[PDB]
């Protein structure tokens, strides 16, 4: 409350850490369903189903350019890819099993790194 705070948290390395578990995420052999926004011309039922698309190229930019203002809102957005992905996709399919494979190395390394 005013003037009652818990020790302050060191969140000077968080964007620099974040950028890092990104560059994981994109380098990974599983995340090409996520690199780019999906084609909302080309691909039928996803700009009607999925109300706030996202993908990896767009939290890049996103947050090289100061528009997170924590290290929660990040994982939001990262939360986001894989939950629309599971919106749209059959569990049984190979996007859907890479959503749910992305989803898990994501947790893992924000636990590793954060936890």
Same mark, same amino acid.
């Given at each position: 409350s005013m003037s009652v705070k818990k020790p302050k948290r060191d969140d000077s390395k968080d964007l620099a850490l974040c950028s890092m578990i990104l560059t994981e995420m994109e380098t990974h052999e599983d995340a090409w369903p996520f690199l780019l926004p999906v084609n909302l011309k080309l691909v039928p039922g996803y =700009? =009607?189903?999925?109300? =706030?698309?996202?993908? %990896?190229?767009?939290?890049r930019e996103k947050l090289?350019?100061?528009?997170?203002?924590?290290l929660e809102t990040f994982a939001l957005d990262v939360r986001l890819v894989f939950d629309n992905c599971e919106t749209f996709n059959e569990d049984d399919s190979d996007i859907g099993r890479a959503?749910?494979?992305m989803r898990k190395y994501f947790e893992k390394k924000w636990t590793?790194? %954060? =936890?």
């Open positions: =700009k =009607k189903v999925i109300k =706030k698309p996202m993908d %990896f190229s767009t939290i090289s350019s100061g528009q997170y203002p924590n959503g749910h494979n590793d790194t %954060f =936890k």
